[PDB]
């Protein structure tokens, strides 16, 4: 299975009430392993997973130092953008940054990313070739010319195809029992009587990892996409995820519906039926 490593950064300006809030988190696939909170007392990068705790002090002092530097960058960016858009110093704005790499099942570099957003909208992003940029608007183009002129893309390329993939591999290795595991979902159905001539059939998939999963309903082998109530995959709080798909079934028709669960943790897809 292919994997990925990603770092997410959120910086929020609090006009008249201190420095902006800066939150940074790192992930390997769907498992968080580090975090940083500018409002936290420690002021250090902290571990959020078992397999990273065994990194020595050098690692923690290094990432803390670099995360603090990231924080400082987003602190200056907020002001730059505030001016690029001629905005009041009273309003609260948000800048987001995301960068990382994906490797194939062969653990080799597949693609790299480095995107940036302002108040929820794309601002600038590195293109797949890792040499050109996608400037959202007019303000974004000023940054693009400056990153072009400074040869920013070239440096990110070195990081995304080198360090990023190398540490991803190291992490995948150090956390084998975790990151390289495949937790099949626990499944079941619930039957609730809507009224007299109908009932809601809900298909459950629980305690599964990674998050990716496909849960669909069928009537006589026909896809019920449009008639399926499908929720957003949520976290259990213990590293596993949960999800459900439901449909309304006319009386005496439970036999016609099948629930199909596709997940990497399954030896073969599952076909559940109320019975």
């Amino acid at each position: 299975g292919s994997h990925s490593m990603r770092y997410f950064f959120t910086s929020v300006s609090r006009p008249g009430r201190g420095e902006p809030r800066f939150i940074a988190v790192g992930y390997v696939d769907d498992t968080q392993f580090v975090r940083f909170d500018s409002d936290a007392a420690s002021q250090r990068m902290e571990p959020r997973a078992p397999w990273i705790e065994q990194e020595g002090p050098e690692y923690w002092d290094g990432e803390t130092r670099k995360v603090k530097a990231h924080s400082q960058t987003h602190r200056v960016d907020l002001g730059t953008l505030r001016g690029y858009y001629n905005q009041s110093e009273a309003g609260s704005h948000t800048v987001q940054r995301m960068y990382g790499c994906d490797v194939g099942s062969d653990w080799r570099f597949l693609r790299g990313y480095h995107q940036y957003a302002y108040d929820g909208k794309d601002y600038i992003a590195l293109k797949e070739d890792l040499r050109s940029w996608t400037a959202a608007d007019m303000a974004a183009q000023t940054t693009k010319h400056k990153w072009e002129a400074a040869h920013v893309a070239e440096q990110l390329r070195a990081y995304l195809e080198g360090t990023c993939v190398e540490w991803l591999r190291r992490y995948l290795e150090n956390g084998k029992e975790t990151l390289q595991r495949t937790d099949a979902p626990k499944t079941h159905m619930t039957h609730h009587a809507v009224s007299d001539h109908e009932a809601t059939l809900r298909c459950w998939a629980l305690s599964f990892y990674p998050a990716e999963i496909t849960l669909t309903w069928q009537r006589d082998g026909e896809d019920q996409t449009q008639d399926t109530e499908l929720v957003e995959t949520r976290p259990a709080g213990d590293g596993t995820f949960q999800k459900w798909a439901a449909v309304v079934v006319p009386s005496g028709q439970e036999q016609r519906y099948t629930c199909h669960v596709q997940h990497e943790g399954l030896p073969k897809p599952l076909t559940l039926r109320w019975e």
Binding site: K66, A69, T73
Partner: peptide
């Protein structure tokens, strides 16, 4: 690990 270079806009 983090990228060692975080240029500013």
């Amino acid at each position: 690990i983090l990228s060692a270079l975080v240029g500013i806009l």
